[PDB]
Ligand binder design. Structure first.
Ligand SMILES: Cc1cc2nc3c(=O)[nH]c(=O)nc-3n(C[C@H](O)[C@H](O)[C@H](O)COP(=O)(O)O)c2cc1C
Ligand SMILES: Cc1cc2nc3c(=O)[nH]c(=O)nc-3n(C[C@H](O)[C@H](O)[C@H](O)COP(=O)(O)O)c2cc1C
Ligand SMILES: [Cl-]
Ligand SMILES: [Cl-]
Lengths: 163, 164
């Protein structure tokens, strides 16, 4: 069920460092991303997929800071989402949902990262200074269990026929 | 395998079967998917205003139409209005929209994300504070027209490995 996939997908903050992601799994994740809807079908994104062992280490280190994202250096894959000139931001959320749901459907863990050293990750991967790097999605096999979800109550987030 | 088949079958449906209602249990599964979306800091900066009343749906759908776009919205029996509840909020709302439309497709329902609409009229019809930003209406209902193949950029334009 789709709902079981939604429930099992979580932010994994620990990865098996020595354990590679298979090329066919990653390709299906990026296909899900590419096939995302977008306003005007503008598809205003580029996914820079870091799979090189040494590069991924460096990208994951540049995602860490201020006590956050220490686990990022352990994920063997980092999908960097660059805005390709409002709706772009909505569109990139769409694509992130498709990446992380696809990762979970493939037995892989993921974590969307909005906090990182944008400058350094852009230098490491040759992204122009003038392009906005918006998210890094870490991908790898998880080592910790499924935590229980915390969400706001229905009444705070959902009303019928009425604000 | 299955997930990718779902991603390919989900599409923007631009015609609805006007007399066929959406089962409440299907709607509830879609809203559960939306609620369970991830968000930066788990802030969940959204409220879903779910229009199921036949007359109100008609009016919200009509207020989505203009410049010859979105004329089919008035035929959708359900409208999920996504209101921002204080960057990340916009990314978060796109996450939630993906969850809603994938969930709709998994239930055998059609959907269309609408970013263009008469925001003031829809707010006035539904009670949404003037000062709160209504960002999307997702129309939900049973489709009339068939599945199309996707038009997307080539892999090479949107995907590069290890370097931009
Ligand atoms: C943020 C957003 C806003 C959209 N607004 C509209 C709209 O107002 N009217 C419309 O007909 N389609 C709307 N679309 C649908 C897009 O045209 C559609 O997703 C895109 O063409 C890709 O086609 P597909 O959804 O059928 O794969 C919107 C999509 C997104 C993501
Ligand atoms: C836009 C965005 C950015 C995120 N940034 C981070 C981040 O930098 N570090 C982190 O540990 N989690 C990050 N997360 C994950 C959220 O904390 C997480 O999705 C939320 O707490 C709900 O938990 P769940 O994803 O396990 O269901 C981010 C999520 C989103 C949507
Ligand atoms: Cl559009
Ligand atoms: Cl967070």
């Amino acid at each position: 069920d789709f709902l079981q996939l939604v429930l099992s997908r979580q932010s994994d903050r620990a990865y098996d460092k020595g354990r590679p992601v298979e090329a066919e799994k990653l390709e299906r994740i990026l296909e899900a991303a590419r096939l995302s809807p977008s306003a005007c079908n503008a598809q205003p994104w580029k996914f820079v997929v870091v799979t090189d062992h040494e590069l991924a280490l460096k990208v994951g280190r540049a995602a860490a800071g201020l006590g956050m994202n220490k686990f990022a250096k352990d994920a063997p894959v980092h999908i960097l989402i660059v805005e390709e000139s409002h709706f772009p931001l909505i569109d990139i959320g769409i694509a992130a949902a498709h990446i992380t749901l696809a990762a979970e459907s493939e037995g892989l863990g993921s974590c969307i990262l909005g906090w990182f050293d944008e400058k350094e990750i852009k230098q490491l991967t040759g992204i122009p200074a003038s392009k906005r790097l918006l998210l890094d999605i870490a991908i790898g096999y998880p080592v910790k269990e499924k935590r229980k979800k915390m969400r706001k109550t229905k009444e705070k987030v959902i009303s019928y026929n009425r604000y």
